[PDB]
Write an enzyme that holds these catalytic residues in place. Sequence first.
Site, PDB file in Angstrom:
ATOM      1  CG  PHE A  67      15.300 -13.492 -65.272  1.00 54.00           C
ATOM      2  CD1 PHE A  67      16.606 -13.943 -65.383  1.00 54.00           C
ATOM      3  CD2 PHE A  67      14.269 -14.353 -65.616  1.00 54.00           C
ATOM      4  CE1 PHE A  67      16.876 -15.230 -65.813  1.00 54.00           C
ATOM      5  CE2 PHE A  67      14.533 -15.639 -66.048  1.00 54.00           C
ATOM      6  CZ  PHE A  67      15.838 -16.078 -66.147  1.00 54.00           C
TER       7      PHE A  67
ATOM      8  CG  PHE B 214      11.624 -10.461 -67.765  1.00 52.69           C
ATOM      9  CD1 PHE B 214      11.673 -11.844 -67.690  1.00 52.69           C
ATOM     10  CD2 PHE B 214      12.624  -9.798 -68.460  1.00 52.69           C
ATOM     11  CE1 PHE B 214      12.708 -12.550 -68.282  1.00 52.69           C
ATOM     12  CE2 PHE B 214      13.656 -10.503 -69.063  1.00 52.69           C
ATOM     13  CZ  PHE B 214      13.698 -11.880 -68.970  1.00 52.69           C
TER      14      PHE B 214
ATOM     15  CD  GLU C 119      11.707 -18.787 -67.985  1.00 53.69           C
ATOM     16  OE1 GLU C 119      12.694 -18.679 -67.225  1.00 53.69           O
ATOM     17  OE2 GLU C 119      11.731 -19.471 -69.031  1.00 53.69           O
ATOM     18  CB  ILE C 120       5.021 -17.829 -65.986  1.00 56.74           C
ATOM     19  CG1 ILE C 120       4.568 -16.805 -64.944  1.00 56.74           C
ATOM     20  CG2 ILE C 120       4.110 -19.046 -65.945  1.00 56.74           C
ATOM     21  CD1 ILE C 120       3.705 -15.707 -65.499  1.00 56.74           C
ATOM     22  CB  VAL C 121       8.872 -22.238 -65.051  1.00 58.53           C
ATOM     23  CG1 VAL C 121       9.459 -23.565 -65.498  1.00 58.53           C
ATOM     24  CG2 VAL C 121       9.939 -21.146 -65.046  1.00 58.53           C
TER      25      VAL C 121
ATOM     26  CB  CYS D 210       0.412 -22.482 -64.707  1.00 55.82           C
ATOM     27  SG  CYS D 210       1.260 -20.898 -64.805  1.00 55.82           S
TER      28      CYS D 210
ATOM     29  CB  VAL E 170      -5.272 -26.391 -60.684  1.00 58.94           C
ATOM     30  CG1 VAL E 170      -6.297 -26.914 -59.674  1.00 58.94           C
ATOM     31  CG2 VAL E 170      -4.854 -24.972 -60.324  1.00 58.94           C
TER      32      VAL E 170
ATOM     33  CD  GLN F  55      -7.409 -29.116 -64.393  1.00 54.65           C
ATOM     34  OE1 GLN F  55      -8.146 -29.223 -65.374  1.00 54.65           O
ATOM     35  NE2 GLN F  55      -6.134 -29.487 -64.412  1.00 54.65           N
ATOM     36  CB  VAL F  56     -13.565 -25.855 -64.021  1.00 56.33           C
ATOM     37  CG1 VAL F  56     -14.807 -25.061 -64.419  1.00 56.33           C
ATOM     38  CG2 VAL F  56     -12.818 -26.325 -65.264  1.00 56.33           C
ATOM     39  CE  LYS F  57     -13.531 -28.008 -57.461  1.00 57.52           C
ATOM     40  NZ  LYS F  57     -13.317 -28.777 -56.201  1.00 57.52           N
ATOM     41  N   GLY F  58     -11.740 -21.441 -60.214  1.00 57.04           N
ATOM     42  CA  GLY F  58     -11.093 -20.184 -59.907  1.00 57.04           C
ATOM     43  C   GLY F  58      -9.749 -20.306 -59.228  1.00 57.04           C
ATOM     44  CE1 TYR F  59      -9.618 -23.173 -54.749  1.00 54.63           C
ATOM     45  CE2 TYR F  59      -9.668 -25.389 -55.649  1.00 54.63           C
ATOM     46  CZ  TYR F  59     -10.006 -24.493 -54.657  1.00 54.63           C
ATOM     47  OH  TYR F  59     -10.738 -24.920 -53.573  1.00 54.63           O
TER      48      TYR F  59
ATOM     49  CB  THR G 269      -8.408 -16.902 -61.757  1.00 56.06           C
ATOM     50  OG1 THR G 269      -8.720 -17.234 -63.117  1.00 56.06           O
ATOM     51  CG2 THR G 269      -8.569 -15.397 -61.569  1.00 56.06           C
TER      52      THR G 269
ATOM     53  CG  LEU H  74       8.452 -11.728 -70.718  1.00 53.72           C
ATOM     54  CD1 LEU H  74       9.908 -11.487 -71.115  1.00 53.72           C
ATOM     55  CD2 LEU H  74       7.510 -11.220 -71.798  1.00 53.72           C
TER      56      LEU H  74
ATOM     57  CE1 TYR I 293      -3.837 -28.928 -78.166  1.00 52.63           C
ATOM     58  CE2 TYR I 293      -1.621 -29.057 -77.272  1.00 52.63           C
ATOM     59  CZ  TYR I 293      -2.538 -29.382 -78.250  1.00 52.63           C
ATOM     60  OH  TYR I 293      -2.156 -30.162 -79.316  1.00 52.63           O
TER      61      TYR I 293
ATOM     62  CB  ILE J 288      12.436 -16.504 -71.059  1.00 55.38           C
ATOM     63  CG1 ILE J 288      12.500 -16.090 -72.533  1.00 55.38           C
ATOM     64  CG2 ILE J 288      12.097 -15.318 -70.177  1.00 55.38           C
ATOM     65  CD1 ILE J 288      11.249 -15.385 -73.023  1.00 55.38           C
TER      66      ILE J 288
ATOM     67  CE1 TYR K 263       9.779 -23.422 -72.249  1.00 52.90           C
ATOM     68  CE2 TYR K 263       9.460 -25.683 -72.969  1.00 52.90           C
ATOM     69  CZ  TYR K 263       9.775 -24.773 -71.978  1.00 52.90           C
ATOM     70  OH  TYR K 263      10.087 -25.211 -70.711  1.00 52.90           O
TER      71      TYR K 263
HETATM   72  C1  LIG Z   1       3.381 -21.507 -69.966  1.00 54.36           C
HETATM   73  C2  LIG Z   1       3.542 -22.958 -69.578  1.00 54.36           C
HETATM   74  O1  LIG Z   1       4.913 -23.335 -69.593  1.00 54.36           O
HETATM   75  C3  LIG Z   1       2.939 -23.185 -68.196  1.00 54.36           C
HETATM   76  O2  LIG Z   1       3.204 -22.509 -67.236  1.00 54.36           O
HETATM   77  S1  LIG Z   1       1.795 -24.495 -68.138  1.00 54.36           S
HETATM   78  C4  LIG Z   1       0.216 -23.592 -68.054  1.00 54.36           C
HETATM   79  C5  LIG Z   1      -0.901 -24.493 -68.546  1.00 54.36           C
HETATM   80  N1  LIG Z   1      -1.144 -25.614 -67.650  1.00 54.36           N
HETATM   81  C6  LIG Z   1      -1.822 -26.694 -68.026  1.00 54.36           C
HETATM   82  O3  LIG Z   1      -2.303 -26.819 -69.149  1.00 54.36           O
HETATM   83  C7  LIG Z   1      -1.966 -27.773 -66.981  1.00 54.36           C
HETATM   84  C8  LIG Z   1      -3.347 -28.392 -66.986  1.00 54.36           C
HETATM   85  N2  LIG Z   1      -4.384 -27.412 -66.695  1.00 54.36           N
HETATM   86  C9  LIG Z   1      -4.573 -26.909 -65.474  1.00 54.36           C
HETATM   87  O4  LIG Z   1      -3.904 -27.245 -64.499  1.00 54.36           O
HETATM   88  C10 LIG Z   1      -5.703 -25.897 -65.328  1.00 54.36           C
HETATM   89  O5  LIG Z   1      -6.552 -25.973 -66.463  1.00 54.36           O
HETATM   90  C11 LIG Z   1      -5.236 -24.435 -65.105  1.00 54.36           C
HETATM   91  C12 LIG Z   1      -5.966 -23.505 -66.081  1.00 54.36           C
HETATM   92  C13 LIG Z   1      -3.725 -24.312 -65.330  1.00 54.36           C
HETATM   93  C14 LIG Z   1      -5.559 -24.004 -63.680  1.00 54.36           C
HETATM   94  O6  LIG Z   1      -6.648 -23.069 -63.682  1.00 54.36           O
HETATM   95  P1  LIG Z   1      -8.117 -23.522 -63.256  1.00 54.36           P
HETATM   96  O7  LIG Z   1      -8.439 -24.794 -63.936  1.00 54.36           O
HETATM   97  O8  LIG Z   1      -8.258 -23.426 -61.784  1.00 54.36           O
HETATM   98  O9  LIG Z   1      -8.970 -22.360 -63.946  1.00 54.36           O
HETATM   99  P2  LIG Z   1      -9.867 -21.173 -63.364  1.00 54.36           P
HETATM  100  O10 LIG Z   1     -11.144 -21.743 -62.884  1.00 54.36           O
HETATM  101  O11 LIG Z   1      -9.046 -20.348 -62.448  1.00 54.36           O
HETATM  102  O12 LIG Z   1     -10.158 -20.365 -64.706  1.00 54.36           O
HETATM  103  C15 LIG Z   1     -10.880 -21.037 -65.757  1.00 54.36           C
HETATM  104  C16 LIG Z   1     -11.174 -20.048 -66.854  1.00 54.36           C
HETATM  105  O13 LIG Z   1     -10.138 -20.124 -67.864  1.00 54.36           O
HETATM  106  C17 LIG Z   1     -10.755 -20.277 -69.127  1.00 54.36           C
HETATM  107  N3  LIG Z   1      -9.832 -20.945 -70.039  1.00 54.36           N
HETATM  108  C18 LIG Z   1      -9.566 -20.589 -71.334  1.00 54.36           C
HETATM  109  N4  LIG Z   1      -8.684 -21.355 -71.931  1.00 54.36           N
HETATM  110  C19 LIG Z   1      -8.348 -22.282 -70.958  1.00 54.36           C
HETATM  111  C20 LIG Z   1      -7.458 -23.376 -70.957  1.00 54.36           C
HETATM  112  N5  LIG Z   1      -6.717 -23.732 -72.010  1.00 54.36           N
HETATM  113  N6  LIG Z   1      -7.358 -24.102 -69.822  1.00 54.36           N
HETATM  114  C21 LIG Z   1      -8.099 -23.751 -68.766  1.00 54.36           C
HETATM  115  N7  LIG Z   1      -8.968 -22.743 -68.650  1.00 54.36           N
HETATM  116  C22 LIG Z   1      -9.047 -22.044 -69.785  1.00 54.36           C
HETATM  117  C23 LIG Z   1     -12.055 -21.023 -68.856  1.00 54.36           C
HETATM  118  O14 LIG Z   1     -12.981 -20.815 -69.917  1.00 54.36           O
HETATM  119  C24 LIG Z   1     -12.495 -20.294 -67.591  1.00 54.36           C
HETATM  120  O15 LIG Z   1     -12.966 -18.969 -67.916  1.00 54.36           O
HETATM  121  P3  LIG Z   1     -14.145 -18.239 -67.067  1.00 54.36           P
HETATM  122  O16 LIG Z   1     -14.798 -19.325 -66.236  1.00 54.36           O
HETATM  123  O17 LIG Z   1     -13.456 -17.188 -66.221  1.00 54.36           O
HETATM  124  O18 LIG Z   1     -15.076 -17.647 -68.101  1.00 54.36           O
END
Ligand SMILES: C[C@@H](O)C(=O)SCCNC(=O)CCNC(=O)[C@H](O)C(C)(C)COP(=O)(O)OP(=O)(O)OC[C@H]1O[C@@H](n2cnc3c(N)ncnc32)[C@H](O)[C@@H]1OP(=O)(O)O
EC number: 2.3.1.48
Lengths: 162, 162, 162, 162, 162, 162, 162, 162
Positions: free
Chosen positions: C68, C73, C75-77, C79, C81, C86-90, C92, C111, C117, C142, C145
Amino acid sequence: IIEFHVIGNSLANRRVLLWLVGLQNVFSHQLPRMPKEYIARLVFDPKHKTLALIKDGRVIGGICFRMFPTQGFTEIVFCAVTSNEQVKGYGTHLMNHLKEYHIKHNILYFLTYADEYAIGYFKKQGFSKDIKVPKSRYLGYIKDYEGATLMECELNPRIPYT
Amino acid sequence: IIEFHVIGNSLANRRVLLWLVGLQNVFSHQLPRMPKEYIARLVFDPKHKTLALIKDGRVIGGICFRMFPTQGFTEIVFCAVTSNEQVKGYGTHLMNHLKEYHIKHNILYFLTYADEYAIGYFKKQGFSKDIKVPKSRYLGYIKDYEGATLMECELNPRIPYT
Amino acid sequence: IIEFHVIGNSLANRRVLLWLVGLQNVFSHQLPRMPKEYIARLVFDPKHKTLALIKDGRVIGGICFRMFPTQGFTEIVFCAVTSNEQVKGYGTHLMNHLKEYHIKHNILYFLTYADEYAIGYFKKQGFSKDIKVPKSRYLGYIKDYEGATLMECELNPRIPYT
Amino acid sequence: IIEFHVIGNSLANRRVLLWLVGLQNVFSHQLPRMPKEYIARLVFDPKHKTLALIKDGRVIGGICFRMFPTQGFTEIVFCAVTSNEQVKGYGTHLMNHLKEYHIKHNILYFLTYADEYAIGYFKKQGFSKDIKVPKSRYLGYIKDYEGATLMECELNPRIPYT
Amino acid sequence: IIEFHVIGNSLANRRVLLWLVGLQNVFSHQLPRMPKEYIARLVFDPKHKTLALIKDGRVIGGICFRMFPTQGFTEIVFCAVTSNEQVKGYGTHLMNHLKEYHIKHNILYFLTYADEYAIGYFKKQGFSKDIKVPKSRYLGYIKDYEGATLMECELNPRIPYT
Amino acid sequence: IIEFHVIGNSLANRRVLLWLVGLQNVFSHQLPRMPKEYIARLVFDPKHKTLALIKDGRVIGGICFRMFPTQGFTEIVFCAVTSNEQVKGYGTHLMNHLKEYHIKHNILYFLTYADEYAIGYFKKQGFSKDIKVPKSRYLGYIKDYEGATLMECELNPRIPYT
Amino acid sequence: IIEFHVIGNSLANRRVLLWLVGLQNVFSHQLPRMPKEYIARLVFDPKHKTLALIKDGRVIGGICFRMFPTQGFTEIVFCAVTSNEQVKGYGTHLMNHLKEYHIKHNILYFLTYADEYAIGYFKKQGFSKDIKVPKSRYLGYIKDYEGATLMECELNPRIPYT
Amino acid sequence: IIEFHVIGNSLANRRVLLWLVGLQNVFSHQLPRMPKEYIARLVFDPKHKTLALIKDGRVIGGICFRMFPTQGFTEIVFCAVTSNEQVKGYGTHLMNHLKEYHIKHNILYFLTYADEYAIGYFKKQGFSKDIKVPKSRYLGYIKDYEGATLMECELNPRIPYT
Ligand SMILES: C[C@@H](O)C(=O)SCCNC(=O)CCNC(=O)[C@H](O)C(C)(C)COP(=O)(O)OP(=O)(O)OC[C@H]1O[C@@H](n2cnc3c(N)ncnc32)[C@H](O)[C@@H]1OP(=O)(O)O
Ligand SMILES: C[C@@H](O)C(=O)SCCNC(=O)CCNC(=O)[C@H](O)C(C)(C)COP(=O)(O)OP(=O)(O)OC[C@H]1O[C@@H](n2cnc3c(N)ncnc32)[C@H](O)[C@@H]1OP(=O)(O)O
Ligand SMILES: C[C@@H](O)C(=O)SCCNC(=O)CCNC(=O)[C@H](O)C(C)(C)COP(=O)(O)OP(=O)(O)OC[C@H]1O[C@@H](n2cnc3c(N)ncnc32)[C@H](O)[C@@H]1OP(=O)(O)O
Ligand SMILES: C[C@@H](O)C(=O)SCCNC(=O)CCNC(=O)[C@H](O)C(C)(C)COP(=O)(O)OP(=O)(O)OC[C@H]1O[C@@H](n2cnc3c(N)ncnc32)[C@H](O)[C@@H]1OP(=O)(O)O
Ligand SMILES: C[C@@H](O)C(=O)SCCNC(=O)CCNC(=O)[C@H](O)C(C)(C)COP(=O)(O)OP(=O)(O)OC[C@H]1O[C@@H](n2cnc3c(N)ncnc32)[C@H](O)[C@@H]1OP(=O)(O)O
Ligand SMILES: C[C@@H](O)C(=O)SCCNC(=O)CCNC(=O)[C@H](O)C(C)(C)COP(=O)(O)OP(=O)(O)OC[C@H]1O[C@@H](n2cnc3c(N)ncnc32)[C@H](O)[C@@H]1OP(=O)(O)O
Ligand SMILES: C[C@@H](O)C(=O)SCCNC(=O)CCNC(=O)[C@H](O)C(C)(C)COP(=O)(O)OP(=O)(O)OC[C@H]1O[C@@H](n2cnc3c(N)ncnc32)[C@H](O)[C@@H]1OP(=O)(O)O
Ligand SMILES: C[C@@H](O)C(=O)SCCNC(=O)CCNC(=O)[C@H](O)C(C)(C)COP(=O)(O)OP(=O)(O)OC[C@H]1O[C@@H](n2cnc3c(N)ncnc32)[C@H](O)[C@@H]1OP(=O)(O)O
């Protein structure tokens, strides 16, 4: 992560334009005795080219050079690698890429003027103080620097450099 | 020979290019705590303009600014005069020319963030810490600098400034 | 081999098309409480873009967003992986690439509406429940919800994120 | 045979013209306290659209509306169903089609002014006297009717309406 | 309101695009042992078409197929009806509309590979395990499925199917 | 830096030309019992393509092939990797990329003739002496080599190969 | 009041044309031994240029020169300042402007033949009788004058002259 | 049966293209110490030409040369006749045709570097180790070969060679 682009101001889009400003910035920081307007004038001169060294999208080094195909050589204008990325091989990689680019354009001689701080790196890059290109061929074409040492590198077109 | 030109990257171009390079160099030297790449990116940004102060064909000062006509104000991004030309009134003449230019465009409010060292110059140019433009109108449009002071100048369109 | 592409339905390309379908598939699997046809409509909306994460040619994640620019700003719609990445830094790295892209476009605010969760992930990406953008600027732009919490991230344009 | 068409004057045209004449007649008869010339001017206004309810090729109802996409809402200008087709659900089907149309355009807020006789119909269509859209966003955009009640409908973009 | 559209990725349309995504979604949910990206690739393949079943504007079923006019047959790739619309005659009406479409194109043979779970549906649609099309004509054209059984349906061009 | 490009003569062209010259040289050296002129004629034949393996801008391997889409198969004409790059997996990566390329074109059968020294490599790439493609479909299309072994590979379009 | 223009006969409008006639007139009056048809031939020769010195719209001095970029130098053909405006610095200002123009064109050597009446002014302008440009590079290009003294000025491109 | 064509890569059709590949092949076989990518680079270099010797449509010999008209000579790059057709006069016929072609282009000097295996043939072709072309005219233009012997042939334009 690492890239190489022979860029220059034509007649350039914005990514190349900001690369050229970065190159002008790095050359200024690394060559403080060179006037920045002089560096900027040559980097953006259309007859000049710059082999740019890009790390993750950011300029970290480059060689500015002036090709003289009708004279049979290229003048080395500016060489620099940013302060924190020096002594890592980037300066040698840049010159090697410049050599490969020039044998592909059938130009086999580099000429440059090196001051005392710079002569050692050019010797490691294969430059010599024995000049084979006749004076009648470079005088008035390359820019003279009084007190600096003219140096020459001859390229082998049957050898790969990269 | 003093000249003022509103220039900027878009879409004499080569002389405008070198002017933009000279402005980025003057801005970088006079604003050392600003990242040089940040300065270059904004100086060459299509939505940004720069009022360049040209003396005998060379850049000696400028004001980089971003007009927000849909919001009713202009953001002042960078202000600088080269060291050897400072304390001659050029900074005041630059701001006055910028004011006259914006009155012709029905933009009557300047916004900027001044740190502790620059507040005094903006005060002498009519800026104030009292902000009449509502926060809903500038937040997220001008770039915020935390711990710096937001300053506002209101221009009188019935007064001549040059 | 991992790349980042800001893609979206224009007016396009078959390689981009199948990536968008892959993104629609991944978003829907990772967001089961979202209607699939709702995800499909937004992913293929010409005002929406998706930063796709491509590992070895196939989609493994992405961030769908609506810029917008006139509001200041984005709007993040969506996200997501894929579960095996997951849990690999992707997630981030995706957010960091999105931040860099918006700095080059002079949009400094994100926003979004986070689940109970997902709210933890956004806090780690620098988001806060303190919203600086006035309500008169985001309400009606935006997508609201009910039950979720609004979250905001402000970007520093003088910092590199990638 | 029931049809819904979004039509309106601009810059089948002759059948759209007669539809617009039929809509102006239905609106004028069902809204007798509205000036007929006022109805005609808005029905044929370039910035206004009308969702026409066509039955066997003839106009039997419509909703005239003015979209304000830059403000995030749409103003509902006239709603009417001809007497012999009332209390058949057409007014509800008209509003539902208008809702589906606006979700496709990312417009999620309806605004209107209802007098004492029409408030009940808008309540049954989800409208409310509680207005979330700020006054700074609609004042001077929608046409105000003093002594009438401002009503707001918020649309859910994840719900199907047709 | 139920319609039949022979659609497919050409070279297209947004309404056709979201239908194709809906078809890719339905096929994948109803055929979980099929890779999603495999379904996506074929649905969006320009040599493939899908006869979409549209109830009230949204996809509820379809048949994806590959015509081989130079070979004299059509390969049936995917058949699906969404779970809440099964056991209503929708799958049979789809097959009948497909047969009519191919009679007008003078293609009188269908070939397909049926699961142990789907083979019953194809027998009811007139398919047989007796294959009249020679192996030299379909092998290498239709996609083989090891373990599944080849099935063939011959169409009568002097009979109406819809 | 490893690259794969499908190239070939028709009707970067100069770099494709030198690649085709490099491929003809690699093929000739690695297949010494093939006539060099025969290799060059096929490498530059308009109906033939070559998947080139490029390492740091230089040809180090390739697969020359002739697609017969009207027949349902592709003939593998030449396979070679330069001596210094052999036994590194490049021959396997070359064949896998060729398989992925042909699945995108709905060509699921490879045919080739392997002599006694090459049979083992094709076996490790999934080829077999059992030929499912009928003789009436390949005779007079692929080039026969008497006393060599006809080999066939059937590709699975649901499997990823890269 | 004072101007500087590098003019010349192209292939010129009337103001430049009358400036050239004035230049030819001043050169004739100030160099009586030069045939006026010879002065006129060179001033209007397309390969020649004249740096013209304008006071209040009137020619009062100029330098006619011939650039030899392929040879790396410029020949100084005619220098003159009108009789009543001499010994005021105009001759030095002209040469300085010529030097600045030539370093901008990357030509760093001036060659000229000065007789006894002229040698002193060129010595004050930095010219020398020690000639660095090889004879093989200027002989036959510059016009020889027997009995005159060949003189050379080397320019520094890192120094500003105006 | 015997033909002569001065061919080369422009910007070439297929017959000339395969002739060039044959030439590159023969040069490689007959000059094993020359890198094949080096031979290929020069044969397909646009500034290079090859006098090709065709027997019954097949390349059996050729001379690759680089004309330097601005320098007044031609460099002899590669000479070769296939193994079984050597010692038959073809090498002399090739050079004679090259001489006739060059006097028609008013270039009257050949320069080449011959190693010990090659010096005898050039002596029979009229080449000499006494070099009349000045070093300042060929150094940096022709490619130097250390340890090889520079040799020169002067042509007579009043004599027919074929
Ligand atoms: C606003 C809304 O409309 C949207 O747009 S839907 C957004 C939410 N979409 C989902 O729900 C879809 C299912 N999910 C995923 O697809 C994946 O879960 C990720 C996260 C989207 C991909 O990211 P990813 O899995 O690659 O994570 P990445 O490794 O980069 O970071 C990991 C670091 O986040 C910390 N952490 C804290 N709270 C959470 C949490 N609730 N979930 C994940 N990690 C979390 C964790 O403790 C670690 O922390 P650290 O290791 O740094 O200490
Ligand atoms: C005069 C002007 O008009 C011109 O014509 S252009 C202007 C040239 N002016 C500068 O550029 C000054 C700023 N400088 C730099 O920006 C970088 O400093 C370099 C020079 C680009 C090296 O780039 P870099 O640091 O990446 O080099 P790299 O890592 O390849 O190593 C280099 C290998 O040369 C050895 N060495 C010996 N003497 C020197 C020396 N003086 N400087 C650097 N290395 C040197 C070193 O000891 C290692 O050799 P080793 O350790 O293997 O024996
Ligand atoms: C985003 C935000 O960060 C920006 O936009 S970055 C702008 C700040 N950029 C710098 O800081 C760069 C370094 N600086 C300069 O480049 C020059 O310094 C100036 C600031 C361009 C003045 O230009 P200038 O020197 O030509 O000024 P000029 O001669 O017109 O006179 C001005 C009158 O203000 C008086 N004065 C009081 N306080 C100050 C002060 N802090 N700085 C300057 N003057 C000051 C001065 O004593 C005289 O007072 P007066 O004689 O009238 O009583
Ligand atoms: C700017 C502003 O001034 C405007 O924009 S001008 C809009 C007002 N234009 C008129 O006034 C024109 C005259 N009128 C008509 O043209 C038709 O009357 C309608 C209003 C188009 C209903 O269309 P329609 O008759 O087809 O309605 P439909 O059959 O969909 O049912 C609707 C359900 O609302 C219940 N209901 C409760 N209160 C009312 C009420 N006041 N009016 C109508 N229905 C009402 C009804 O009893 C049923 O209730 P349910 O059976 O669902 O419980
Ligand atoms: C070859 C392969 O690559 C493909 O292309 S995937 C094809 C298979 N795709 C699936 O598996 C997806 C999940 N499934 C569905 O999406 C739906 O199941 C239907 C059937 C695709 C939609 O059709 P539908 O549900 O609308 O059926 P409809 O009501 O038209 O006919 C119902 C009449 O089929 C009789 N019948 C016998 N055997 C079966 C059987 N195995 N399944 C269903 N019905 C069967 C039943 O006994 C009744 O017989 P009747 O009532 O006439 O006596
Ligand atoms: C028309 C018809 O005439 C043609 O189309 S002409 C094709 C034949 N062109 C040549 O003959 C040229 C000379 N050759 C080469 O250019 C390279 O040799 C290769 C063939 C491109 C392998 O490429 P490459 O060396 O990169 O192979 P890569 O590293 O992928 O491994 C491969 C795995 O097959 C195992 N293996 C078993 N038997 C053989 C065999 N006969 N040759 C090669 N590998 C073999 C090996 O031991 C490893 O086995 P693993 O380690 O997997 O168990
Ligand atoms: C030969 C031909 O083929 C060429 O190649 S071109 C033809 C060149 N032929 C002429 O042009 C003759 C007519 N002449 C004039 O048109 C003007 O006379 C000038 C020469 C354009 C000076 O222009 P100008 O008078 O404006 O000079 P300016 O005021 O800069 O002063 C000059 C500074 O040189 C000192 N000086 C020393 N010797 C001389 C000298 N011989 N003439 C003038 N100044 C001289 C002077 O004493 C002061 O030095 P200072 O007093 O500071 O020590
Ligand atoms: C160094 C490089 O960078 C260059 O600059 S280019 C590269 C040059 N490198 C080669 O080309 C090597 C491969 N070679 C060939 O491809 C052919 O060998 C030739 C050279 C094209 C002759 O072509 P050709 O065999 O058709 O020659 P032709 O039949 O005209 O006879 C030739 C008459 O020279 C007498 N002769 C004396 N010394 C030699 C000698 N070394 N080679 C050939 N002949 C020689 C011979 O004895 C007869 O003389 P006669 O018998 O009459 O006294």
